[PDB]
Point group: C2
Chain length 81, copies 2
């Protein structure tokens, strides 16, 4: 199973296309393949701290059938809503 | 948005635990869900340009049943393999 070869040269073909670098392809060295499932939720929410109200952004990730709740992000959107 | 409010409280909680802040919930202002399905690829590979050889980090995210391939990372690892 060497689809890994296609992705490697193609990865050089896009750095060939992105940047103007003419790199020749040697061979695949190491590989790591992990299929990602689930359903990601972006939540914009209103919250309170020190009496003042703030607005944050929360990127939550789930694998609901495996009892997985993981929080990837908690950015601060608005200091003064 | 009745039990995604339930997941909005998740975010503020695991924030406070991970972050030691004291945010108290308010309400959700907006939310968009994104079901994800695909395969990701981490490949080190050997490259050649200008004579001597190199090795590159390559992050590759593809959705195989659409033949779509997305090249994300391509960071130079070392100029010595």
């Amino acid at each position: 199973s060497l689809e890994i070869d296609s992705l490697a040269r193609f990865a050089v073909d896009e750095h060939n296309k992105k940047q103007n670098t003419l790199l020749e392809f040697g061979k695949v060295l190491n590989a790591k393949q992990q299929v990602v499932s689930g359903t990601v939720y972006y939540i914009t929410l209103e919250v309170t701290d020190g009496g003042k109200k703030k607005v944050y952004e929360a990127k939550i990730w789930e694998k609901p059938w495996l009892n997985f709740k993981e929080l990837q992000e908690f950015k601060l959107i608005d200091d003064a809503p």
